[PDB]
Amino acid sequence: QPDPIAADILRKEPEQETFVRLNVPLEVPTSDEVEAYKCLQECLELRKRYVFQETVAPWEKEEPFAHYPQGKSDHCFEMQDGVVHVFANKDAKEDLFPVADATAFFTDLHHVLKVIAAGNIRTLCHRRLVLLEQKFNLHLMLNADKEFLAQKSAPHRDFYNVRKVDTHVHHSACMNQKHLLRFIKSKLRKEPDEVVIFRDGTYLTLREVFESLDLTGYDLNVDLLDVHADKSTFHRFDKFNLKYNPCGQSRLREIFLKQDNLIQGRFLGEITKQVFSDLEASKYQMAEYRISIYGRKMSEWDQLASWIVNNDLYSENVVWLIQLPRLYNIYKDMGIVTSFQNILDNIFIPLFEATVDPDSHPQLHVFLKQVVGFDLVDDESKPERRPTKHMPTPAQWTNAFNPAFSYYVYYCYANLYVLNKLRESKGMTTITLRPHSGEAGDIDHLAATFLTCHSIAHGINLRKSPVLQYLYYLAQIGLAMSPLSNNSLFLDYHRNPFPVFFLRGLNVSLSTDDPLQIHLTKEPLVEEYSIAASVWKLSACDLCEIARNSVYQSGFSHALKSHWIGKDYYKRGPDGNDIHKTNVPHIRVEFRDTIWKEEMQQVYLGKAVISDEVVP
Amino acid sequence: QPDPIAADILRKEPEQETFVRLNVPLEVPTSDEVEAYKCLQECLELRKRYVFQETVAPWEKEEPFAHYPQGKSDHCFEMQDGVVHVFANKDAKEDLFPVADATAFFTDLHHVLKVIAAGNIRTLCHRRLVLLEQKFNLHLMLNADKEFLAQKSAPHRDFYNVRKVDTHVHHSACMNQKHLLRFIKSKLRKEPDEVVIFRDGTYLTLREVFESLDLTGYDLNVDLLDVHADKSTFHRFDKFNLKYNPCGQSRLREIFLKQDNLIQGRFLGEITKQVFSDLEASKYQMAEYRISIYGRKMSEWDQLASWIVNNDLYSENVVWLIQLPRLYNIYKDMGIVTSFQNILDNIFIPLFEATVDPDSHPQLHVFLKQVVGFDLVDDESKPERRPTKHMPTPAQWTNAFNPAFSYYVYYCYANLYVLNKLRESKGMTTITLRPHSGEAGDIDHLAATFLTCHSIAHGINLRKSPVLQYLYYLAQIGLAMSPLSNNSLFLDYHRNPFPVFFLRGLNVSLSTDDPLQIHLTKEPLVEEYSIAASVWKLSACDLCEIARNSVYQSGFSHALKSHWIGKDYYKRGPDGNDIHKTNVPHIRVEFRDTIWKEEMQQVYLGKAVISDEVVP
Ligand SMILES: O=P(O)(O)OC[C@H]1O[C@@H](n2cnc3c2N=CNC[C@H]3O)[C@H](O)[C@@H]1O
Ligand SMILES: O=P(O)(O)OC[C@H]1O[C@@H](n2cnc3c2N=CNC[C@H]3O)[C@H](O)[C@@H]1O
Ligand SMILES: [Zn+2]
Ligand SMILES: [Zn+2]
């Protein structure tokens, strides 16, 4: 079928839906290089024996948004070697005895990294991926209309109706210029002489700052009109720094697009709100906004938390992921930090503290019941010495350079982890590791990412490794991709792997990134889905399949998933999707669940794991 | 450069704009087959000595929206052979002695139709078109950045800011389902028991009609849920009939998407309004909504007129074109008409009458000062006997079949014409012939269209005739194209000629057609420009160049053109575009004006027409 934008009007009385279609059996035996599949098994296990997961899952669960007293003690943190330890409430000598040490995770990483580029396995996986594609195509050739029509039995639900989530957005870029601009243009007119910032000697009003930069008012525009502390002074304003680097920042940008500024945030916040309202307008578009924490100051956490509250920043549709930019090397010139450790300390303690004693870090709590995952960033392509095994602890790391990627995630994993396996303990919300990974850079980012995280933000590079791509299939790791953005720098649009990763059944989702820089419409991400559908030729069952599993990839409450997709959603497979609220043919997912079940069987060579429920 | 969606942030102080760039001279002499160029000349002249144009143009021009008395007599219509005559106010014997007769226009048509497919000319034109492309590309290779940057001197203006016009939209399809639906869904809830229609025996309420069709309410959806007078009764509901055919029409459709229905329009109108309001919201998107008149009943005109008024249907941004569906053959089974003539009579008299005596057809007037052009339609591919020269008058045409295309436009031209050369006379607004042509069907549609009309709606078929395509270049005929729609039936997206017609400098524009069926966003046509920009790789200078000349193609007041583009807009060439309100490099259009000037010179072999002002 492919491409709904066009699709003409038709008919119908289907008032009783239909599974059933062409089944395609194949099966294939096996060669001596089963000792490959074996290798996959390991990597497949490893990941499992690692990525943390809540011992008791959401669906097995037993006015405003803030306050309420708690108090309950329970103690000790005791962070040893970048990996916190939290010993038994009193004082133990074993602790909540979890997590695998740094080295190990590095040696397992090499392990994956071997198999990953080992000759014959690269071959088998390629053969199996492309083989995966074909089948889906063949299937399309036999059943696209069977799928088209099923959708007609759920008269109500069509594209709009289905709730789709912007699984990868950076809060800040989340606004359309026409709006943003007009926000500014206005708050100038209707309030010039209002102190805003204090740079170069005195506090300036608004009118000041502007005439100060000169080029201002009716001339203002999103483009480079964030022209600075202002001068000749040197700062590169590529793009990552323009959002990832806290300092050397411009003037309007410090005023309007940040929170740790002077007027506390009265303007960024203020903007967010009208974002949310219009968000809550179209009812179906959700958002997993990325918010930062550099880990230079212990405050940042509470500091940010309070930003949320004091501004009443909450929506049903929005949740948050904390993004820590991997910029230590900058924070080590600026002398504000002395050894990597300091950072683990600025993010993995201000929380932990808040977990043991809620009230020691109140309205940080009311925030964390809204935080859903920890995303780490920066230009993936900056060069790096890929970590060995005998690797310097986090507090032996004083040297001038930024620690590698792998290194980042690791300590960013354990902590996250050992902290998670307690907020769980105490019955509080938990955060998931959802790294930006594989957008550029080295292949190992993914390898490591594969061993330790939930979702992922990019995956563009899975395209250069049959093997990792194949695992991610099996494992069903889920990718939140922004084609339209990826198209900016790193990759031509038409050369982007999404559609292909989609055909082969990888857990892909379409995201947005920077709607400010990127889109032309009032409705950002729909517009994504829409140009996507058109260049790649996608049907609705296709978009709907995408939007649907955007949600599975999401971090919202069971209460809302159930209501959005189905009360049976926790079920592995077809019997787990209510087309009346999903609009995707029981037959598309049955095809998908059975081709996957098949592959799994191929690799656990008859002796498969199975599981009858999805996962978190 | 190509593709703005991505484009990263940069800088700048350009506060003094720059023409200047790589000029590329070529020149070429000529062969004996100059007697080709000659042939072009003729066709080029012919068109000229035909398409009507206002002896005194808009820029040389010397609260609510309705009323005011006039009265002034002036008389006689006297339509001879489908071609009205309007003799001197009193009683003459020569009339306002204009227009060329039917035959002639048919023999000139053959003439064009010969040269058009004559061997060596097809060759020369292909060679010259593709040669046209190259140059533009080369130019892009030498100056894209020169163009990128110029745009940075007009800080203010970027894509949004620039006013773009939806030069081809069918009123009715102009709404997004989510809205349309919710309109309905609601007016059910908040007002069931309200008579709406009287079909099958009695007048039904709303609740009735619905439960009458059964499938209703929370189940309603744009798709085929226009299920009829209802039964087994046979009616094809492809798509053209679903909007072009007045009868055999459904129930909700008769209620909500039409005006000549029972509750007068209280619902279609009512809907339009909130379309306009939101239209007037985004300030920059205009609309040239198509509205129909079948010409079965003399009333239709006044009948419609009054629909506009009594509902206060006016916007700065919207104007109208009357679309008459070429369905005589249906109206000749239905016995409601006896010979083609009757139709010329139902559209070219209810107006004419209104021109001589304004007050004999008041608030028809207040309407026509808003009508801007006459668009005629239907499935272009339906087969047809392409008209000869000795051709049956309009009132000798009683036979069972629909008259050919050519035939339609002809009599639809003269009338339009001879009427135009009087509403002008009396100082009243005039209407332009803006046919839907060359979307499918035979090549001659365009040939004829080329000889007699202003803009055009499709042009997809210029792609199969070097020659017509080349004329349309020279002449600068302007095409209002809907790729996204054309993609539905007639043509794959990626195989659509637009981008190419754009490269070669044809007067192209991006349109919408049926935003109801077609788009996924709140903002229809921007979304067009946006998927276009992305699959074809267009820069902003590119879109802006497009949006800009969408307006040149438009039918609005000089008062608004000037304000939207520039007060010098009437000027042929570069010195005629104010980048500060157009955002397109004086250098892009200088390139375009000079390559055209060049080609013209090639064909009028040194002895060129010239003109220092555009045209209407
Ligand atoms: O494209 P502008 O509006 O000048 O800003 C881009 C910012 O948004 C985020 N962003 C945009 N695109 C991406 C982003 N995030 C991570 N890396 C690559 C990709 O995800 C970046 O953090 C970056 O600081
Ligand atoms: O695609 P739907 O919403 O079921 O209705 C299509 C209608 O909109 C107009 N339309 C759509 N697409 C086009 C149209 N007009 C002329 N012909 C081809 C093209 O312009 C047609 O008049 C047609 O009746
Ligand atoms: Zn990102
Ligand atoms: Zn049309």
Side-chain angles (χ1 to χ4, degrees):
Chain A
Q1 269 304 205
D3 211 301
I5 323 261
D8 233 294
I9 227 156
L10 206 209
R11 60 127 352 63
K12 285 157 82 303
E13 64 282 292
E15 301 332 330
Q16 50 273 188
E17 59 231 70
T18 48
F19 262 85
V20 177
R21 66 264 165 27
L22 274 297
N23 256 277
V24 253
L26 324 297
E27 279 50 327
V28 57
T30 166
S31 156
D32 303 42
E33 269 50 27
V34 42
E35 38 141 337
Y37 279 112
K38 277 163 60 186
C39 290
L40 270 42
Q41 298 179 301
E42 304 157 353
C43 302
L44 216 287
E45 311 290 53
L46 281 166
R47 170 177 165 93
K48 201 172 290 177
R49 252 302 207 195
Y50 253 142
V51 20
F52 154 92
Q53 64 178 292
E54 279 191 59
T55 214
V56 171
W59 52 78
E60 1 181 69
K61 56 81 186 172
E62 189 210 333
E63 41 179 336
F65 69 98
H67 188 43
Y68 284 146
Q70 163 74 335
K72 268 63 184 199
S73 280
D74 155 37
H75 316 88
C76 108
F77 284 176
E78 245 284 287
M79 177 175 317
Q80 308 200 199
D81 310 88
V83 189
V84 15
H85 275 20
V86 58
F87 280 81
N89 181 178
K90 47 155 119 66
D91 303 305
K93 188 43 54 198
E94 322 81 20
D95 81 282
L96 145 151
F97 70 117
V99 90
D101 61 7
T103 157
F105 159 86
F106 275 174
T107 77
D108 283 354
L109 194 166
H110 271 64
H111 195 214
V112 178
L113 230 53
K114 165 51 66 182
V115 34
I116 203 186
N120 57 68
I121 308 179
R122 293 180 69 68
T123 334
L124 156 48
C125 290
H126 192 284
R127 171 189 157 154
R128 211 96 191 114
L129 247 33
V130 33
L131 217 12
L132 233 309
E133 197 168 348
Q134 203 58 15
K135 304 187 187 190
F136 177 63
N137 276 147
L138 221 189
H139 169 278
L140 273 244
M141 249 176 270
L142 284 350
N143 313 304
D145 12 36
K146 270 172 197 42
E147 293 166 349
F148 177 88
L149 302 157
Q151 303 190 137
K152 302 254 167 170
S153 64
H156 190 46
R157 198 127 307 203
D158 194 23
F159 194 53
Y160 34 120
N161 319 73
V162 38
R163 296 100 157 75
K164 60 277 273 214
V165 274
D166 196 334
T167 64
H168 159 270
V169 238
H170 291 275
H171 170 50
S172 98
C174 61
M175 53 212 59
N176 149 37
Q177 26 210 52
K178 202 139 81 78
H179 173 246
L180 166 62
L181 302 185
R182 191 152 38 54
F183 184 43
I184 303 173
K185 234 277 95 211
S186 279
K187 236 59 183 157
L188 172 300
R189 179 190 304 84
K190 308 152 189 295
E191 199 168 8
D193 351 288
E194 133 97 298
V195 262
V196 162
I197 186 48
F198 169 61
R199 67 111 137 83
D200 69 1
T202 181
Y203 281 62
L204 309 253
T205 82
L206 207 90
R207 158 107 99 299
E208 314 235 279
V209 154
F210 272 55
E211 75 199 329
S212 157
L213 288 194
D214 191 340
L215 277 163
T216 54
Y218 165 94
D219 283 327
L220 167 66
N221 75 217
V222 59
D223 191 53
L224 203 271
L225 274 49
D226 88 84
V227 295
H228 294 74
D230 195 81
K231 223 163 55 54
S232 63
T233 173
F234 174 74
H235 18 60
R236 49 242 296 181
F237 38 49
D238 54 346
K239 167 262 243 306
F240 298 77
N241 293 194
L242 248 150
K243 204 282 168 185
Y244 284 160
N245 185 166
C247 68
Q249 213 56 258
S250 142
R251 297 322 179 179
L252 310 299
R253 158 151 264 125
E254 196 182 46
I255 302 175
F256 303 173
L257 307 157
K258 222 310 143 81
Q259 55 104 16
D260 176 43
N261 79 174
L262 226 68
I263 190 67
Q264 315 127 146
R266 208 178 82 79
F267 279 88
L268 185 291
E270 175 169 292
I271 229 310
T272 289
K273 198 63 174 177
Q274 42 225 306
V275 128
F276 293 4
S277 91
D278 292 5
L279 193 59
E280 279 179 332
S282 261
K283 172 161 65 171
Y284 318 117
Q285 284 60 37
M286 268 62 273
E288 290 201 292
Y289 287 122
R290 255 70 166 187
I291 268 210
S292 24
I293 276 195
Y294 323 58
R296 53 214 295 225
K297 296 169 74 56
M298 216 63 64
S299 349
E300 278 164 320
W301 267 132
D302 237 300
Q303 164 63 216
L304 165 59
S306 32
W307 176 58
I308 328 298
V309 197
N310 309 321
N311 270 97
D312 122 283
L313 282 180
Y314 157 88
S315 177
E316 193 110 292
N317 336 345
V318 175
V319 291
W320 314 76
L321 290 95
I322 256 43
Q323 51 165 24
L324 156 275
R326 296 107 59 182
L327 300 196
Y328 157 89
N329 69 321
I330 276 210
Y331 311 140
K332 220 276 163 165
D333 200 63
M334 312 207 133
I336 189 158
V337 95
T338 114
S339 98
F340 192 53
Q341 175 68 50
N342 293 300
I343 342 219
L344 306 163
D345 289 313
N346 285 90
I347 50 200
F348 292 117
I349 307 206
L351 36 73
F352 230 119
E353 228 138 56
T355 59
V356 159
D357 186 63
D359 297 321
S360 89
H361 288 272
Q363 39 88 291
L364 164 284
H365 245 199
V366 356
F367 174 58
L368 290 183
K369 67 203 296 184
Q370 218 68 3
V371 166
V372 318
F374 187 108
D375 197 340
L376 57 185
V377 292
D378 205 24
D379 181 314
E380 289 240 20
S381 58
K382 296 181 181 181
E384 74 185 305
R385 258 98 98 275
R386 204 166 64 185
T388 172
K389 28 283 184 312
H390 31 64
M391 218 62 178
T393 72
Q396 283 181 116
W397 190 276
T398 9
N399 67 76
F401 317 123
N402 202 162
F405 188 65
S406 335
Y407 191 112
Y408 260 78
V409 313
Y410 172 79
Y411 296 93
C412 231
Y413 153 45
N415 284 169
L416 231 304
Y417 179 57
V418 202
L419 142 61
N420 265 310
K421 224 159 193 194
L422 177 149
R423 303 207 71 225
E424 133 137 291
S425 159
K426 195 88 280 181
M428 281 181 282
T429 73
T430 65
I431 35 199
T432 179
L433 184 44
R434 313 243 259 95
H436 245 66
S437 160
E439 176 174 28
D442 201 11
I443 195 56
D444 73 295
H445 293 4
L446 297 172
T449 232
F450 154 75
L451 280 165
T452 56
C453 330
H454 205 69
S455 161
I456 242 188
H458 275 295
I460 295 329
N461 271 295
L462 261 14
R463 96 209 200 76
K464 290 149 83 83
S465 151
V467 190
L468 282 190
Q469 191 173 327
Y470 194 52
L471 278 347
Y472 281 88
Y473 175 64
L474 284 23
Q476 277 291 290
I477 280 174
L479 281 8
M481 306 167 65
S482 279
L484 202 29
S485 158
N486 282 149
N487 158 240
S488 271
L489 240 159
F490 322 100
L491 222 171
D492 172 10
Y493 198 79
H494 310 256
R495 276 167 56 55
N496 188 136
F498 174 86
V500 176
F501 283 146
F502 169 63
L503 257 39
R504 309 165 175 196
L506 256 74
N507 191 349
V508 312
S509 34
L510 274 189
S511 51
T512 263
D513 225 8
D514 299 342
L516 219 193
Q517 208 64 184
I518 316 178
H519 311 72
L520 278 62
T521 66
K522 213 144 280 288
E523 316 203 74
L525 80 333
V526 142
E527 183 194 23
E528 193 90 4
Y529 286 65
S530 198
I531 68 167
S534 263
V535 335
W536 300 130
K537 301 137 166 284
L538 279 21
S539 64
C541 170
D542 289 342
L543 299 178
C544 297
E545 196 201 355
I546 286 185
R548 152 185 215 246
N549 70 323
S550 70
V551 161
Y552 269 69
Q553 214 161 179
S554 166
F556 301 78
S557 67
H558 153 139
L560 209 36
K561 262 151 165 44
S562 306
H563 176 56
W564 287 327
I565 44 183
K567 60 190 181 63
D568 274 300
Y569 86 62
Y570 46 118
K571 235 109 73 172
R572 198 299 304 297
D575 50 356
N577 129 242
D578 174 8
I579 155 157
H580 265 113
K581 284 200 167 156
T582 220
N583 198 53
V584 5
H586 354 30
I587 134 178
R588 166 56 71 68
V589 40
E590 182 187 1
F591 165 73
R592 286 255 140 97
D593 180 55
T594 210
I595 179 60
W596 170 78
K597 191 121 64 63
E598 217 160 355
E599 298 295 332
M600 265 301 163
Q601 264 316 327
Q602 191 62 39
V603 32
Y604 272 151
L605 53 227
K607 318 311 156 188
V609 186
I610 288 183
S611 179
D612 294 301
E613 275 180 306
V614 203
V615 105
Chain B
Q1 269 304 205
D3 211 301
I5 323 261
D8 233 294
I9 227 156
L10 206 209
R11 60 127 352 63
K12 285 157 82 303
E13 64 282 292
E15 301 332 330
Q16 50 273 188
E17 59 231 70
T18 48
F19 262 85
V20 177
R21 66 264 165 27
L22 274 297
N23 256 277
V24 253
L26 324 297
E27 279 50 327
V28 57
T30 166
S31 156
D32 303 42
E33 269 50 27
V34 42
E35 38 141 337
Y37 279 112
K38 277 163 60 186
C39 290
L40 270 42
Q41 298 179 301
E42 304 157 353
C43 302
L44 216 287
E45 311 290 53
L46 281 166
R47 170 177 165 93
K48 201 172 290 177
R49 252 302 207 195
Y50 253 142
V51 20
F52 154 92
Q53 64 178 292
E54 279 191 59
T55 214
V56 171
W59 52 78
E60 1 181 69
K61 56 81 186 172
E62 189 210 333
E63 41 179 336
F65 69 98
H67 188 43
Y68 284 146
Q70 163 74 335
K72 268 63 184 199
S73 279
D74 155 37
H75 316 88
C76 108
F77 284 176
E78 245 284 287
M79 177 175 317
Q80 308 200 199
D81 310 88
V83 189
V84 15
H85 275 20
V86 58
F87 280 81
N89 181 178
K90 47 155 119 66
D91 303 305
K93 188 43 54 198
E94 322 81 20
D95 81 282
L96 145 151
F97 70 117
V99 90
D101 61 7
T103 157
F105 159 86
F106 275 174
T107 77
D108 283 354
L109 194 166
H110 271 64
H111 195 214
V112 178
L113 230 53
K114 165 51 66 182
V115 34
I116 203 186
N120 57 68
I121 308 179
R122 293 180 69 68
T123 334
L124 156 48
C125 290
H126 192 284
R127 171 189 157 154
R128 211 96 191 114
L129 247 33
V130 33
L131 217 12
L132 233 309
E133 197 168 348
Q134 203 58 15
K135 304 186 187 190
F136 177 63
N137 276 147
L138 221 189
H139 169 278
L140 273 244
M141 249 176 270
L142 284 350
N143 313 304
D145 12 36
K146 270 172 197 42
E147 293 166 349
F148 177 88
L149 302 157
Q151 303 190 137
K152 302 254 167 170
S153 64
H156 190 46
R157 198 127 307 203
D158 194 23
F159 194 53
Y160 34 120
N161 319 73
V162 38
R163 296 100 157 75
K164 60 277 273 214
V165 274
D166 196 334
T167 64
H168 159 270
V169 238
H170 291 275
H171 170 50
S172 98
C174 61
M175 53 212 59
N176 149 37
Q177 26 210 52
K178 202 139 81 78
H179 173 246
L180 166 62
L181 302 185
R182 191 152 38 54
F183 184 43
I184 303 173
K185 234 277 95 211
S186 280
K187 236 59 183 157
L188 172 300
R189 179 190 304 84
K190 308 152 189 295
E191 199 168 8
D193 351 288
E194 133 97 298
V195 262
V196 162
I197 186 48
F198 169 61
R199 67 111 137 83
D200 69 1
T202 181
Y203 281 62
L204 309 253
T205 82
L206 207 90
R207 158 107 99 299
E208 314 235 279
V209 154
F210 272 55
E211 75 199 329
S212 157
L213 288 194
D214 191 340
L215 277 163
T216 54
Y218 165 94
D219 283 327
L220 167 66
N221 75 217
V222 59
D223 191 53
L224 203 271
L225 274 49
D226 88 84
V227 295
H228 294 74
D230 195 81
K231 223 163 55 54
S232 63
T233 173
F234 174 74
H235 18 60
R236 49 242 296 181
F237 38 49
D238 54 346
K239 167 262 243 306
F240 298 77
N241 293 194
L242 248 150
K243 204 282 168 185
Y244 284 160
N245 185 166
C247 68
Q249 213 56 258
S250 142
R251 297 322 179 179
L252 310 299
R253 158 151 264 125
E254 196 182 46
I255 302 175
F256 303 173
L257 307 157
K258 222 310 143 81
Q259 55 104 16
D260 176 43
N261 79 174
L262 226 68
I263 190 67
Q264 315 127 146
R266 208 178 82 79
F267 279 88
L268 185 291
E270 175 169 292
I271 229 310
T272 289
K273 198 63 174 177
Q274 42 225 306
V275 128
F276 293 4
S277 91
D278 292 5
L279 193 59
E280 279 179 332
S282 261
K283 172 161 65 171
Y284 318 117
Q285 284 60 37
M286 268 62 273
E288 290 201 292
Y289 287 122
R290 255 70 166 187
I291 268 210
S292 24
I293 276 195
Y294 323 58
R296 53 214 295 225
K297 296 169 74 56
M298 216 63 64
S299 349
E300 278 164 320
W301 267 132
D302 237 300
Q303 164 63 216
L304 165 59
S306 32
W307 176 58
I308 328 298
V309 197
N310 309 321
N311 270 97
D312 122 283
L313 282 180
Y314 157 88
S315 177
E316 193 110 292
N317 336 345
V318 175
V319 291
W320 314 76
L321 290 95
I322 256 43
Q323 51 165 24
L324 156 275
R326 296 107 59 182
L327 300 196
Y328 157 89
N329 69 321
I330 276 210
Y331 311 140
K332 220 276 163 165
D333 200 63
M334 312 207 133
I336 189 158
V337 95
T338 114
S339 98
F340 192 53
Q341 175 68 50
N342 293 300
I343 342 219
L344 306 163
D345 289 313
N346 285 90
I347 50 200
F348 292 117
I349 307 206
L351 36 73
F352 230 119
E353 228 138 56
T355 59
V356 159
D357 186 63
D359 297 321
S360 89
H361 288 272
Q363 39 88 291
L364 164 284
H365 245 199
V366 356
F367 174 58
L368 290 183
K369 67 203 296 184
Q370 218 68 3
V371 166
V372 318
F374 187 108
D375 197 340
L376 57 185
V377 292
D378 205 24
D379 181 314
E380 289 240 20
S381 58
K382 296 181 181 181
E384 74 185 305
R385 258 98 98 275
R386 204 166 64 185
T388 172
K389 28 283 184 312
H390 31 64
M391 218 62 178
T393 72
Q396 283 181 116
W397 190 276
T398 9
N399 67 76
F401 317 123
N402 202 162
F405 188 65
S406 335
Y407 191 112
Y408 260 78
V409 313
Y410 172 79
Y411 296 93
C412 231
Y413 153 45
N415 284 169
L416 231 304
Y417 179 57
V418 202
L419 142 61
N420 265 310
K421 224 159 193 194
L422 177 149
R423 303 207 71 225
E424 133 137 291
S425 159
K426 195 88 280 181
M428 281 181 282
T429 73
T430 65
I431 35 199
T432 179
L433 184 44
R434 313 243 259 95
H436 245 66
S437 160
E439 176 174 28
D442 201 11
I443 195 56
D444 73 295
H445 293 4
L446 297 172
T449 232
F450 154 75
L451 280 165
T452 56
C453 330
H454 205 69
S455 161
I456 242 188
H458 275 295
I460 295 329
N461 271 295
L462 261 14
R463 96 209 200 76
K464 290 149 83 83
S465 151
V467 190
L468 282 190
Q469 191 173 327
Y470 194 52
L471 278 347
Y472 281 88
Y473 175 64
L474 284 23
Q476 277 291 290
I477 280 174
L479 281 8
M481 306 167 65
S482 279
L484 202 29
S485 158
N486 282 149
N487 158 240
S488 271
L489 240 159
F490 322 100
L491 222 171
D492 172 10
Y493 198 79
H494 310 256
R495 276 167 56 55
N496 188 136
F498 174 86
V500 176
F501 283 146
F502 169 63
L503 257 39
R504 309 165 175 196
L506 256 74
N507 191 349
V508 312
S509 34
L510 274 189
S511 51
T512 263
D513 225 8
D514 299 342
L516 219 193
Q517 208 64 184
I518 316 178
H519 311 72
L520 278 62
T521 66
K522 213 144 280 288
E523 316 203 74
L525 80 333
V526 142
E527 183 194 23
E528 193 90 4
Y529 286 65
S530 198
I531 68 167
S534 263
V535 335
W536 300 130
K537 301 137 166 284
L538 279 21
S539 64
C541 170
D542 289 342
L543 299 178
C544 297
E545 196 201 355
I546 286 185
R548 152 185 215 246
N549 70 323
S550 70
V551 161
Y552 269 69
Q553 214 161 179
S554 166
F556 301 78
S557 67
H558 153 139
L560 209 36
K561 262 151 165 44
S562 306
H563 176 56
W564 287 327
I565 44 183
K567 59 190 181 63
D568 274 300
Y569 86 62
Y570 46 118
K571 235 109 73 172
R572 198 299 304 297
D575 50 356
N577 129 242
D578 174 8
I579 155 157
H580 265 113
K581 284 200 167 156
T582 220
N583 198 53
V584 5
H586 354 30
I587 134 178
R588 166 56 71 68
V589 40
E590 182 187 1
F591 165 73
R592 286 255 140 97
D593 180 55
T594 210
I595 179 60
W596 170 78
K597 191 121 64 63
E598 217 160 355
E599 298 295 332
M600 265 301 163
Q601 264 316 327
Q602 191 62 39
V603 32
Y604 272 151
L605 53 227
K607 318 311 156 188
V609 186
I610 288 183
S611 179
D612 294 301
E613 275 180 306
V614 203
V615 105

